[PDB]
Curated annotation (Swiss-Prot):
Name by which UniProt lists this protein: Small ribosomal subunit protein eS31
Post-translational events: Monoubiquitinated at Lys-25 and Lys-31 by RNF25 in response to ribosome collisions (ribosome stalling): ubiquitination promotes subsequent activation of RNF14, leading to EEF1A1 ubiquitination and degradation and rescue of stalled ribosomes. Deubiquitination at Lys-31 by USP16 is required for maturation of the 40S ribosomal complex.
Residues included from the entire protein: 83 to 150 of 156
Subunit text: Part of the 40S ribosomal subunit. Part of the small subunit (SSU) processome, composed of more than 70 proteins and the RNA chaperone small nucleolar RNA (snoRNA) U3.
Renumbered residue ranges of the record's region Disordered: 1-13
Signal peptide start and end residues: none
Function: Component of the 40S subunit of the ribosome. Part of the small subunit (SSU) processome, first precursor of the small eukaryotic ribosomal subunit. During the assembly of the SSU processome in the nucleolus, many ribosome biogenesis factors, an RNA chaperone and ribosomal proteins associate with the nascent pre-rRNA and work in concert to generate RNA folding, modifications, rearrangements and cleavage as well as targeted degradation of pre-ribosomal RNA by the RNA exosome.
Lineage: Eukaryota, Metazoa, Chordata, Craniata, Vertebrata
Compartments where located: Cytoplasm; Nucleus, Nucleolus
Zinc finger (C4-type): 39-62
Glycyl lysine isopeptide (Lys-Gly) (interchain with G-Cter in ubiquitin) cross-link site: 25, 31
N6-acetyllysine: modified positions: 22, 31
Top-rank taxon: Eukaryota
Length: 68
RNA sequence: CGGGAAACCAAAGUCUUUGGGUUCCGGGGGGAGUAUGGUUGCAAAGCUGAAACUUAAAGGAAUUUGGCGAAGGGCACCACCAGGAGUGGAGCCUGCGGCUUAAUUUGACUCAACACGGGAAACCUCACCCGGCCCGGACACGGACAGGAUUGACAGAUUGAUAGCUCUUUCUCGAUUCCGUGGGUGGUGGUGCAUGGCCGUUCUUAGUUGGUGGAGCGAUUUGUCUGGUUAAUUCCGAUAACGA
RNA sequence: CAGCCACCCGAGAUUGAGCAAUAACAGGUCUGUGAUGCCCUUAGAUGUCCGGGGCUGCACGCGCGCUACACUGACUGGCUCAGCGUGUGCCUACCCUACGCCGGCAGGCGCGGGUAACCCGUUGAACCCCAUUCGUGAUGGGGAUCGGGGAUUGCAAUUAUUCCCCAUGAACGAGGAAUUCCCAGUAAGUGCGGGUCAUAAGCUUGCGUUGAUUAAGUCCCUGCCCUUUGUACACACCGCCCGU
């Protein structure tokens, strides 16, 4: 029920639509162009990408941060 | 002998196998030996004496535990005598009550609670408190679908932590899930005055019970006792009791 | 008669302990359990989990225990005698120690033994015995309180976990009313094992050494059991029942 102390809500992940639009760029030619840097770790595959931050990228379940 | 409901009775006997003669007197218990009327008396008060109403009991005899401010016995170093060590007085450890505390968690209060719960706890113990995350809400019904129902986290504000528990920021797991209702699980939450089991105490004292038979209409009683002995209802013995 | 006492012979002419009848307590345990009825909670938890704290906090009152008040003694050396036991784990990592060095000390590294009458271990235990110092003085009694330093256990010792070394040296002069336990290897003075245990016993249960004074009785006190008697009680005296 409603207690005296406030409670922060859980991390409700907002649904993002048409994410498959935002992975590759499509031109008149059939050659694709990836928009994200690829993770070279052997735990994940070659189809996964990295996170899109504003300073540096971030891998998936590998949780490895690579600088420049 | 006989009789009675039995205590008991040579009369309370000679009584359904009722009948010797003759006076007074009682028909559940209260109201009530009261009111009125008469009568007797100096007075107090004696004699005769109802009804209305109310109740399903009031009473008599007698056996077993019960309870005595009744009597008589027996046993016990958790009772005493004669003694030994002592405790209670001093300091320390432990437990309980009280005060105090955000909390100082709780049960047990004469034997039969207080170094007890196998309780000598720094953290787990923990059942108590200040605080924050994980779900360990199974399974069904109805909303959302592989285009995503969510878990897993990094320069920086942040408790407490590099628990991403949040907020800047999105690849990662793919139908294993999120949401409302039934329902389910977990609970050192409450009730031992609902219990089961276990244990303690009366009691570790020496006390219980049938079979046959005797007595009484019967409940019931003797056996299980006046006495002697023993740690002992342990034996002996007097004895309608023998055998267990 | 049941049996009792003393004596001779003979190891013992009463060694100790386990279970312990019918019936009953509103005795204790829902905090031993996945034994459990009902009730409460269940996502923002009364479950679970983590960090830290508190069960230990003190004007005070009570019960089990330990050390003492000393010369029947304290201190310092030497002599010499035991028995129950225990000892390397499913989860699991905490086993018992001989032997040679370092250090006054607790403790530190290697060489080993034992899955056990094999190794610790002939468990060289304490009390006791012998010889000096001390001399009735709150004193070499008593060791509370406390300061500094050094080690082990563990992630963490502060509200000293514990141990060791040096200082500190209070109360206490055999204790009021009251009260506990005990008849022979008994009480008592002493030590050693087991449980608790990561470090650990002023507690409990066992083992062993030295080892007595008094009693072979009673119902006075404290309780229990039984017989006789009385009952207007049978919810049983916490009973029944009279009157304004
Ligand atoms: Zn990767």
């Amino acid at each position: 029920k409603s207690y005296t102390t406030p409670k922060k809500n859980k991390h409700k992940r907002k649904k993002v639509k048409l994410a498959v639009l935002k992975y590759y760029k499509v031109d008149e030619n059939g050659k694709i162009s990836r928009l994200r840097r690829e993770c070279p770790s052997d735990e994940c595959g070659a189809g996964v990408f990295m996170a899109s931050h504003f300073d540096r990228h971030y891998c998936g379940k590998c949780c490895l941060t690579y600088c420049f």
